[PDB]
Amino acid sequence: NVAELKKSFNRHLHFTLVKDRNVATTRDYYFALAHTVRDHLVGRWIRTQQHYYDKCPKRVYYLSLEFYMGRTLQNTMINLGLQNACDEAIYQLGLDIEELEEIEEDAGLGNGGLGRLAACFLDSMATLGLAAYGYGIRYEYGIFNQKIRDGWQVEEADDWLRYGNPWEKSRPEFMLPVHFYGKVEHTNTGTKWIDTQVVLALPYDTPVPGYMNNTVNTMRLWSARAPGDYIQAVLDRNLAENISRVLYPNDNFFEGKELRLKQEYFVVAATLQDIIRRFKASKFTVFDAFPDQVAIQLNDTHPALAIPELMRIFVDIEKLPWSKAWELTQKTFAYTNHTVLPEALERWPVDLVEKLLPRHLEIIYEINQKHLDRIVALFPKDVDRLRRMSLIEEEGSKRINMAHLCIVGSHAVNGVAKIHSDIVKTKVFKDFSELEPDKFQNKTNGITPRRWLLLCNPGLAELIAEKIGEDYVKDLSQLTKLHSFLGDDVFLRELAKVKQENKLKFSQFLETEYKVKINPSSMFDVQVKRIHEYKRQLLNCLHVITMYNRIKKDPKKLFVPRTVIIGGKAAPGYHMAKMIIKLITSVADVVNNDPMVGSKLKVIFLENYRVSLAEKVIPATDLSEQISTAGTEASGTGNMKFMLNGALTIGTMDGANVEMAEEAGEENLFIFGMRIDDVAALDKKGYEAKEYYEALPELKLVIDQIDNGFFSPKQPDLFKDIINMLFYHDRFKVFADYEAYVKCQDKVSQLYMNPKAWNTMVLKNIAASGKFSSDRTIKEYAQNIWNVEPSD
Amino acid sequence: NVAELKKSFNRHLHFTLVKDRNVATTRDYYFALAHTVRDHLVGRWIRTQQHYYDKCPKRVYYLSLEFYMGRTLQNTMINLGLQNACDEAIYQLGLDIEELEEIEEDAGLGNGGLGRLAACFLDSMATLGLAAYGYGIRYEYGIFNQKIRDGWQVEEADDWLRYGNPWEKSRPEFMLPVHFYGKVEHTNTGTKWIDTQVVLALPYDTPVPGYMNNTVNTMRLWSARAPGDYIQAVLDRNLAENISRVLYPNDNFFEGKELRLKQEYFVVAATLQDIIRRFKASKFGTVFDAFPDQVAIQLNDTHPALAIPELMRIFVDIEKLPWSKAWELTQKTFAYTNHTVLPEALERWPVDLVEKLLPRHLEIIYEINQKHLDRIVALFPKDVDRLRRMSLIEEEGSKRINMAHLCIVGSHAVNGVAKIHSDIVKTKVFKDFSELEPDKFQNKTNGITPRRWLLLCNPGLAELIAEKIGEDYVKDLSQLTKLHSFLGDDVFLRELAKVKQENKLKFSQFLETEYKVKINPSSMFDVQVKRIHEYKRQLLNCLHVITMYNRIKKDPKKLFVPRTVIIGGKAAPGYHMAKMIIKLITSVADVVNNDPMVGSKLKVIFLENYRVSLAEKVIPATDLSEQISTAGTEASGTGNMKFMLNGALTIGTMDGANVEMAEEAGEENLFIFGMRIDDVAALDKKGYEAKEYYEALPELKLVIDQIDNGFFSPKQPDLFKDIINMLFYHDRFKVFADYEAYVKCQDKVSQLYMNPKAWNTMVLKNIAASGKFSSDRTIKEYAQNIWNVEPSD
Ligand SMILES: *Cc1c(COP(=O)(O)O)cnc(C)c1O
Ligand SMILES: *Cc1c(COP(=O)(O)O)cnc(C)c1O
Ligand SMILES: CC(=O)N[C@@H]1O[C@H](CO)[C@@H](O)[C@H](O)[C@H]1O
Ligand SMILES: CC(=O)N[C@@H]1O[C@H](CO)[C@@H](O)[C@H](O)[C@H]1O
């Protein structure tokens, strides 16, 4: 009750923060409330873990280098059914819970979709009652804080643990040693990796509360600690601890740095030991049942080294015969592929691996040897097949194809969207899937309806609950029941009203953050995600300029006002992406300050886009931009978040976009541009950018405007690199989709002119978004890959 | 009551540790109990701080680079009066209180006596109800952990915060920026220190509970945090945070490293800002006229010397006060404590280094110096040497700043730590200065807290005394003189000795389990524990051990008082001699300990990893305390006081506080020997010829040749060449010059040890006269004659 929550809060403020109400700070209150909320998890956390030991169900281990978790407080309050009461207690204490909630640092230990999927999964798995564990690195610094200086992205260290994290519990008794470098000996008592360097792995446990269900699972993040001149030797301890120091800020791009390889082995070695530990300590030659008790999901190839590591443990330590160890290994691992771009592919140079992980390279060679021995046996005269299927790339400086390793060391390989999984199976890994068709499957991504609905959009969640009950929260497929209210004008009005309140709250945020007067009744056109060429924020920028020009040539023409928001972080070393940011801020400066356009159109670059900000901007969106070149977005997930929160989608037939269309009906989505096939034919025929440039007046003007310095007077050639790429090196064919895009955009504004018809489509969307719950995704994984059963 | 303490303990284990009794670990329990104990401090902590704001009494600020605090749990339980109840609750919960307590990591943010004095002071000041604050650095790594490998000291990182510290509370809202480097700008708006590098200073507060008195003061320790290639730039953040990373392991030795200078400015800048900020927020542009009446900053040796030019910098560059005023307020604010006379310990920073790190401060230091010498010239026109002798700058060769001179001129009071010491500091070392201002120089004999050094480390003795004279002595140690009434009490003397016996037995067990050696429980425990240093003469002790060993061989049947000689202490990592002397002791130990001839007649142990928590163990179990520093080298000493309070007799020179212990207990009740400060001066004049004693004393010569010929290092006959060479041609501490008197003195000790009744009689005379050495007395004198603050009860 309220009375007791206030007692607890005041107790923590007193004993935990050691503060008086007259000298407490907002951070003091936030921490007090956080502890008060955490205390309500303890019982179920301890109980849940105990229960797994007692009933010994098969455990699922999600191994990933990233966990884009965002904030915890509110998510915990909601999942525990404590939000309303905490809200009231904090209120009665003369405080604003929303003010306390903003003090919390995001746990941005991720780059984007890949890291956010793990976070959503952790939520679903706990909600479905699975004995699941999240394993990753406790980066001292997550994804950098993006600031905008003179229109350019600037990075600042994300010191998220500076003031402490009340949601974690260090478990020193489970500390483990990790080995790096050294050499290998093949003694008569088994082979031995000796003269290695050791780095301790200290685990920190974070509670993962299921939604209203008695389950609180665990997320275990490891921290690196260290085991001439004295002072210097002490300072040098920083080198070992530098391993879990900061997250590599790359999204869909492989950067073969040695430190990154260390991070990868670090988490893979600490996790496997811990897993083997817990197994050999369970109630249960003993390892014969390992695969029936353990399931390790490989989040992309980053934790690929987990395969040769398990084998290493099985053979070098447990002394099992290779045959057995290898059989158990394949049964233990499952690999998820989320890559398409060739630059995202992880190909480690054998020289680097040999120097850091000598024993693992040997194991990888062995796996490869036995692997190709099989192909040769099956396809004798196929010599190319061998080099095409080898885990080693001999071409020039030899490199290890981590994906091939994952495919051979796993009993299941999956894509993240029908379209994606199909290309992965039939195209990218045809040689492999041909041998074992059954191994390759699909698992369309999903998002958690808790954080992405109940939490970020209470108004909508409430509206829906009032009309169909709260069952939808644990079974989102229940949203189809909203189809009964299609002809309900009072409901459509309520729906729109909810969206209006969202836009207003967010508009305030914008006005206070940026010096710009937002038009509360304008259509909110939002494209938020990591800045990437394949994502085409550039394409969007051409439409904004294209829109601006139209306003000048006819400032009196009836126009649907718009507030175009574009946000996203750029990898620090991604030049183009950083150039595209400058362009947007540049175009924004002109548009936003032209007295001619005035309140007809406003452009904002949403700074520091992250999970907590996404929860703010998504619920306030009218139009969601998902315009990646066909075949480039494996699936996407932000797309699903917009659809669930009442936004219409303008996008290509790419990733999950295709499935959202299947569910809601293509006509209820603004699909445009060329499809995967058209992109192939254009590739064959060849891509001549200038053609569209000369063929389309609207475009040409936009381009020349960009090229001539219209958006950068003091630096006319500022966007030279962009213009050059656009014309001679655009793999994502921006101009090839410009016409269809702008045409599509016009149709959007048209429908926006008919409120009743717009909210009708919106409803058709929300009502058909159930499929995209990460609860459905996890059920399919558990059923067809992990072989585990859910409980309640 | 017990019932409630058990409730809280179980609540913390559950909610704070998130653990079940079936999976909890000992550390889990230790942390649970710690939190349970901390909770009982909160009210008084919050209340005490509030009270200072309300009644605004003058605040004392102890600025030091070291705070050797040891463990907190038990000390907190005792001071709060919760030990019994906590003891009770943990017992009923079926847990071993001793096992939980030994879990606690030592807070060794100090090197030895200088850092331990601050820790003791914090305790007294809180016990006396003073509005005092301790300010220092929160080193991630304190004094290294010493291990012994192949008889050699080995250092291991002291990762004391690895599992967390339940006694601290980070206060981020009080975070401050510190500046380094940059350049000085001389404009019309004045002087602007521009283009500096910034390092954040994050404070962590630790409660300092007074003994049974409602007061809980604060110890504020600062942590450094940071404000091309991205990843690399992030990793490079380690450079700023490296400032508060580890404590420099030097004792009585100056190591002019730039990082150390950074640590020194870091703590001095964060502290002054914080002090100035609390002053403005107090109830007193801004008016600082009353600053000195509200603030007192005690400089613990010259390490935080930069605090002077920094206050001036703040006063002038920021607050815009006129130099005249700022300088007047500054002197009234600062007081400086001189802790040593060892030239090699003297802090003399090269002006080039300071100029590059703290450009503005060098200017301020020059200004201070200019105005300073301007005064001397006015008073002593024809005295040109006096000028260079009194200058804050040493122009001799590479110019250096004499931090001590700076402290003397920027303080209204300068003090030594023992009568003998303070006298040399005043009349000799700084005669030129004291001559000008006699009244500025004073003495404040050191003291130790009777809480941690009696009640905590020696419950049996504390209890015995309480049973005979009441517990008033704990807050007024002078009450120990009441124990003189039991001089002719044979039953009491027997009880006293018994207490000591139980101590020796408990510790003997420790030794047997730690080291593979059979200790003789009835042997006299000869202990010399302190930092390894030549001036301290552990080497002298080693010659007596060898001298003793040789006697046992030439007559294994001679009636002999058995002994267990223990020698412990850490050596500064880069201190060669000290590390050689350690090897010698372990070497001599190996021979003696394994000679079937000597057997249980004599055993030698090198107490590994000597630290505060171990000192609490070995001191109460000591019969003979070795305080044999060369006359004039130990400013005061404090371990000496700890032994005296715990029932050990003292064998030592007339040095430091040894002289005062003698005054109190009576010289005849102390085993004083060797030459005194004067004799050392005459020998210096006459010159020191080591070989003389070597050739003049057979016992010695044999010892030496034994050492020199490889008797103690067969596989390496010349191993101790450097030692032998120093002993003969470069021994500034005249080890041979005191060898005869020393060994003679040692014999007298064994003699008295043969008469139990007469030995415990002297011991009683010692314990009964140790009251003066309570840090409660020391702090009272500081408050009274330096800080001008009144105690609150
Ligand atoms: C959901 C989410 C993403 C993934 O978005 P896409 O548009 O699918 O790339 C990226 N960043 C954040 C902060 C997210 O919440
Ligand atoms: C008291 C104490 C000292 C001081 O010893 P002296 O022999 O007086 O130099 C040094 N270290 C520790 C651990 C102490 O407790
Ligand atoms: C390498 C990588 O980060 N892939 C990303 O993964 C997420 C989650 O699978 C997909 O939705 C998205 O399309 C894709 O860009
Ligand atoms: C510089 C330094 O560490 N000096 C030491 O200070 C302590 C505390 O005052 C004295 O007891 C001791 O004699 C002296 O050696």
mmCIF file with all atom_site columns, N, CA and C in Angstrom, chain A residues 521-555:
data_model
loop_
_atom_site.group_PDB
_atom_site.id
_atom_site.type_symbol
_atom_site.label_atom_id
_atom_site.label_alt_id
_atom_site.label_comp_id
_atom_site.label_asym_id
_atom_site.label_entity_id
_atom_site.label_seq_id
_atom_site.pdbx_PDB_ins_code
_atom_site.Cartn_x
_atom_site.Cartn_y
_atom_site.Cartn_z
_atom_site.occupancy
_atom_site.B_iso_or_equiv
_atom_site.pdbx_formal_charge
_atom_site.auth_seq_id
_atom_site.auth_comp_id
_atom_site.auth_asym_id
_atom_site.auth_atom_id
_atom_site.pdbx_PDB_model_num
ATOM 1   N N  . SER A 1 521 ? -0.323 20.746 -34.065 1.00 0.00 ? 521 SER A N  1
ATOM 2   C CA . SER A 1 521 ? -1.288 20.103 -34.947 1.00 0.00 ? 521 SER A CA 1
ATOM 3   C C  . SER A 1 521 ? -0.648 19.589 -36.235 1.00 0.00 ? 521 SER A C  1
ATOM 4   N N  . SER A 1 522 ? 0.662  19.766 -36.348 1.00 0.00 ? 522 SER A N  1
ATOM 5   C CA . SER A 1 522 ? 1.383  19.313 -37.528 1.00 0.00 ? 522 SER A CA 1
ATOM 6   C C  . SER A 1 522 ? 1.588  17.810 -37.463 1.00 0.00 ? 522 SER A C  1
ATOM 7   N N  . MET A 1 523 ? 1.759  17.196 -38.625 1.00 0.00 ? 523 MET A N  1
ATOM 8   C CA . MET A 1 523 ? 1.983  15.761 -38.700 1.00 0.00 ? 523 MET A CA 1
ATOM 9   C C  . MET A 1 523 ? 3.404  15.507 -38.233 1.00 0.00 ? 523 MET A C  1
ATOM 10  N N  . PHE A 1 524 ? 3.574  14.591 -37.291 1.00 0.00 ? 524 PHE A N  1
ATOM 11  C CA . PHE A 1 524 ? 4.908  14.281 -36.792 1.00 0.00 ? 524 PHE A CA 1
ATOM 12  C C  . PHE A 1 524 ? 5.547  13.177 -37.629 1.00 0.00 ? 524 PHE A C  1
ATOM 13  N N  . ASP A 1 525 ? 6.462  13.584 -38.503 1.00 0.00 ? 525 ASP A N  1
ATOM 14  C CA . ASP A 1 525 ? 7.189  12.685 -39.393 1.00 0.00 ? 525 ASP A CA 1
ATOM 15  C C  . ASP A 1 525 ? 8.507  12.330 -38.698 1.00 0.00 ? 525 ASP A C  1
ATOM 16  N N  . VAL A 1 526 ? 8.607  11.098 -38.208 1.00 0.00 ? 526 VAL A N  1
ATOM 17  C CA . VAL A 1 526 ? 9.803  10.693 -37.484 1.00 0.00 ? 526 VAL A CA 1
ATOM 18  C C  . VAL A 1 526 ? 10.580 9.521  -38.054 1.00 0.00 ? 526 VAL A C  1
ATOM 19  N N  . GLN A 1 527 ? 11.897 9.686  -38.125 1.00 0.00 ? 527 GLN A N  1
ATOM 20  C CA . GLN A 1 527 ? 12.791 8.625  -38.577 1.00 0.00 ? 527 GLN A CA 1
ATOM 21  C C  . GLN A 1 527 ? 13.907 8.604  -37.554 1.00 0.00 ? 527 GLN A C  1
ATOM 22  N N  . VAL A 1 528 ? 13.840 7.654  -36.630 1.00 0.00 ? 528 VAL A N  1
ATOM 23  C CA . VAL A 1 528 ? 14.844 7.538  -35.588 1.00 0.00 ? 528 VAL A CA 1
ATOM 24  C C  . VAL A 1 528 ? 15.464 6.153  -35.619 1.00 0.00 ? 528 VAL A C  1
ATOM 25  N N  . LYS A 1 529 ? 16.791 6.128  -35.678 1.00 0.00 ? 529 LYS A N  1
ATOM 26  C CA . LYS A 1 529 ? 17.566 4.892  -35.716 1.00 0.00 ? 529 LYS A CA 1
ATOM 27  C C  . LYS A 1 529 ? 19.028 5.286  -35.895 1.00 0.00 ? 529 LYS A C  1
ATOM 28  N N  . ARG A 1 530 ? 19.922 4.305  -35.921 1.00 0.00 ? 530 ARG A N  1
ATOM 29  C CA . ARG A 1 530 ? 21.338 4.608  -36.094 1.00 0.00 ? 530 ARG A CA 1
ATOM 30  C C  . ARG A 1 530 ? 21.529 5.222  -37.477 1.00 0.00 ? 530 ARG A C  1
ATOM 31  N N  . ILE A 1 531 ? 22.416 6.208  -37.565 1.00 0.00 ? 531 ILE A N  1
ATOM 32  C CA . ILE A 1 531 ? 22.680 6.862  -38.839 1.00 0.00 ? 531 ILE A CA 1
ATOM 33  C C  . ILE A 1 531 ? 23.494 5.929  -39.729 1.00 0.00 ? 531 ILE A C  1
ATOM 34  N N  . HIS A 1 532 ? 22.904 5.542  -40.850 1.00 0.00 ? 532 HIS A N  1
ATOM 35  C CA . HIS A 1 532 ? 23.579 4.655  -41.766 1.00 0.00 ? 532 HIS A CA 1
ATOM 36  C C  . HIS A 1 532 ? 23.096 4.870  -43.182 1.00 0.00 ? 532 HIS A C  1
ATOM 37  N N  . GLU A 1 533 ? 24.010 4.767  -44.137 1.00 0.00 ? 533 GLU A N  1
ATOM 38  C CA . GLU A 1 533 ? 23.662 4.957  -45.536 1.00 0.00 ? 533 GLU A CA 1
ATOM 39  C C  . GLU A 1 533 ? 22.597 3.983  -46.019 1.00 0.00 ? 533 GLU A C  1
ATOM 40  N N  . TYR A 1 534 ? 22.680 2.729  -45.589 1.00 0.00 ? 534 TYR A N  1
ATOM 41  C CA . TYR A 1 534 ? 21.701 1.742  -46.027 1.00 0.00 ? 534 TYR A CA 1
ATOM 42  C C  . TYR A 1 534 ? 20.316 2.069  -45.494 1.00 0.00 ? 534 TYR A C  1
ATOM 43  N N  . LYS A 1 535 ? 20.284 2.812  -44.390 1.00 0.00 ? 535 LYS A N  1
ATOM 44  C CA . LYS A 1 535 ? 19.030 3.216  -43.753 1.00 0.00 ? 535 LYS A CA 1
ATOM 45  C C  . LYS A 1 535 ? 18.381 4.398  -44.478 1.00 0.00 ? 535 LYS A C  1
ATOM 46  N N  . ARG A 1 536 ? 19.190 5.124  -45.245 1.00 0.00 ? 536 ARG A N  1
ATOM 47  C CA . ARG A 1 536 ? 18.743 6.261  -46.049 1.00 0.00 ? 536 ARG A CA 1
ATOM 48  C C  . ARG A 1 536 ? 18.126 7.486  -45.389 1.00 0.00 ? 536 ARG A C  1
ATOM 49  N N  . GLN A 1 537 ? 18.774 8.007  -44.354 1.00 0.00 ? 537 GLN A N  1
ATOM 50  C CA . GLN A 1 537 ? 18.282 9.223  -43.718 1.00 0.00 ? 537 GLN A CA 1
ATOM 51  C C  . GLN A 1 537 ? 18.502 10.319 -44.769 1.00 0.00 ? 537 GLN A C  1
ATOM 52  N N  . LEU A 1 538 ? 19.435 10.056 -45.681 1.00 0.00 ? 538 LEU A N  1
ATOM 53  C CA . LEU A 1 538 ? 19.762 10.971 -46.769 1.00 0.00 ? 538 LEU A CA 1
ATOM 54  C C  . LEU A 1 538 ? 18.560 11.108 -47.709 1.00 0.00 ? 538 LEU A C  1
ATOM 55  N N  . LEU A 1 539 ? 17.927 9.978  -48.021 1.00 0.00 ? 539 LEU A N  1
ATOM 56  C CA . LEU A 1 539 ? 16.753 9.971  -48.880 1.00 0.00 ? 539 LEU A CA 1
ATOM 57  C C  . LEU A 1 539 ? 15.705 10.878 -48.241 1.00 0.00 ? 539 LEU A C  1
ATOM 58  N N  . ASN A 1 540 ? 15.504 10.716 -46.940 1.00 0.00 ? 540 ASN A N  1
ATOM 59  C CA . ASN A 1 540 ? 14.539 11.523 -46.207 1.00 0.00 ? 540 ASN A CA 1
ATOM 60  C C  . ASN A 1 540 ? 14.896 13.007 -46.313 1.00 0.00 ? 540 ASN A C  1
ATOM 61  N N  . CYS A 1 541 ? 16.184 13.307 -46.231 1.00 0.00 ? 541 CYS A N  1
ATOM 62  C CA . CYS A 1 541 ? 16.668 14.677 -46.311 1.00 0.00 ? 541 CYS A CA 1
ATOM 63  C C  . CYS A 1 541 ? 16.365 15.321 -47.656 1.00 0.00 ? 541 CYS A C  1
ATOM 64  N N  . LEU A 1 542 ? 16.343 14.526 -48.716 1.00 0.00 ? 542 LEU A N  1
ATOM 65  C CA . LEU A 1 542 ? 16.052 15.070 -50.036 1.00 0.00 ? 542 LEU A CA 1
ATOM 66  C C  . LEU A 1 542 ? 14.569 15.437 -50.112 1.00 0.00 ? 542 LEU A C  1
ATOM 67  N N  . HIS A 1 543 ? 13.736 14.653 -49.436 1.00 0.00 ? 543 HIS A N  1
ATOM 68  C CA . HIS A 1 543 ? 12.301 14.912 -49.425 1.00 0.00 ? 543 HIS A CA 1
ATOM 69  C C  . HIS A 1 543 ? 11.999 16.163 -48.608 1.00 0.00 ? 543 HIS A C  1
ATOM 70  N N  . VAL A 1 544 ? 12.782 16.398 -47.556 1.00 0.00 ? 544 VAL A N  1
ATOM 71  C CA . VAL A 1 544 ? 12.586 17.576 -46.713 1.00 0.00 ? 544 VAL A CA 1
ATOM 72  C C  . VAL A 1 544 ? 12.908 18.827 -47.528 1.00 0.00 ? 544 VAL A C  1
ATOM 73  N N  . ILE A 1 545 ? 14.012 18.773 -48.268 1.00 0.00 ? 545 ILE A N  1
ATOM 74  C CA . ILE A 1 545 ? 14.428 19.892 -49.099 1.00 0.00 ? 545 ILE A CA 1
ATOM 75  C C  . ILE A 1 545 ? 13.408 20.023 -50.217 1.00 0.00 ? 545 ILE A C  1
ATOM 76  N N  . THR A 1 546 ? 12.990 18.885 -50.758 1.00 0.00 ? 546 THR A N  1
ATOM 77  C CA . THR A 1 546 ? 11.998 18.865 -51.820 1.00 0.00 ? 546 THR A CA 1
ATOM 78  C C  . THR A 1 546 ? 10.703 19.529 -51.330 1.00 0.00 ? 546 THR A C  1
ATOM 79  N N  . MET A 1 547 ? 10.369 19.318 -50.060 1.00 0.00 ? 547 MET A N  1
ATOM 80  C CA . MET A 1 547 ? 9.166  19.904 -49.473 1.00 0.00 ? 547 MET A CA 1
ATOM 81  C C  . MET A 1 547 ? 9.345  21.407 -49.271 1.00 0.00 ? 547 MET A C  1
ATOM 82  N N  . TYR A 1 548 ? 10.519 21.786 -48.781 1.00 0.00 ? 548 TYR A N  1
ATOM 83  C CA . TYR A 1 548 ? 10.849 23.179 -48.524 1.00 0.00 ? 548 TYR A CA 1
ATOM 84  C C  . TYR A 1 548 ? 10.752 24.010 -49.804 1.00 0.00 ? 548 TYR A C  1
ATOM 85  N N  . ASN A 1 549 ? 11.337 23.508 -50.883 1.00 0.00 ? 549 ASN A N  1
ATOM 86  C CA . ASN A 1 549 ? 11.308 24.222 -52.151 1.00 0.00 ? 549 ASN A CA 1
ATOM 87  C C  . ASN A 1 549 ? 9.873  24.488 -52.608 1.00 0.00 ? 549 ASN A C  1
ATOM 88  N N  . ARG A 1 550 ? 8.987  23.508 -52.418 1.00 0.00 ? 550 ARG A N  1
ATOM 89  C CA . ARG A 1 550 ? 7.581  23.642 -52.818 1.00 0.00 ? 550 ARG A CA 1
ATOM 90  C C  . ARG A 1 550 ? 6.894  24.762 -52.048 1.00 0.00 ? 550 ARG A C  1
ATOM 91  N N  . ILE A 1 551 ? 7.271  24.931 -50.785 1.00 0.00 ? 551 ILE A N  1
ATOM 92  C CA . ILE A 1 551 ? 6.685  25.965 -49.943 1.00 0.00 ? 551 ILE A CA 1
ATOM 93  C C  . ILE A 1 551 ? 7.051  27.374 -50.411 1.00 0.00 ? 551 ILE A C  1
ATOM 94  N N  . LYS A 1 552 ? 8.223  27.518 -51.017 1.00 0.00 ? 552 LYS A N  1
ATOM 95  C CA . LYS A 1 552 ? 8.673  28.819 -51.496 1.00 0.00 ? 552 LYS A CA 1
ATOM 96  C C  . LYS A 1 552 ? 8.006  29.193 -52.809 1.00 0.00 ? 552 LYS A C  1
ATOM 97  N N  . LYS A 1 553 ? 7.946  28.231 -53.723 1.00 0.00 ? 553 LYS A N  1
ATOM 98  C CA . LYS A 1 553 ? 7.338  28.429 -55.029 1.00 0.00 ? 553 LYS A CA 1
ATOM 99  C C  . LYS A 1 553 ? 5.814  28.556 -54.945 1.00 0.00 ? 553 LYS A C  1
ATOM 100 N N  . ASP A 1 554 ? 5.269  28.504 -53.734 1.00 0.00 ? 554 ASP A N  1
ATOM 101 C CA . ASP A 1 554 ? 3.825  28.602 -53.551 1.00 0.00 ? 554 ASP A CA 1
ATOM 102 C C  . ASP A 1 554 ? 3.477  28.572 -52.066 1.00 0.00 ? 554 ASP A C  1
ATOM 103 N N  . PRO A 1 555 ? 3.904  29.600 -51.314 1.00 0.00 ? 555 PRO A N  1
ATOM 104 C CA . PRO A 1 555 ? 3.643  29.688 -49.873 1.00 0.00 ? 555 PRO A CA 1
ATOM 105 C C  . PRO A 1 555 ? 2.172  29.761 -49.484 1.00 0.00 ? 555 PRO A C  1
#
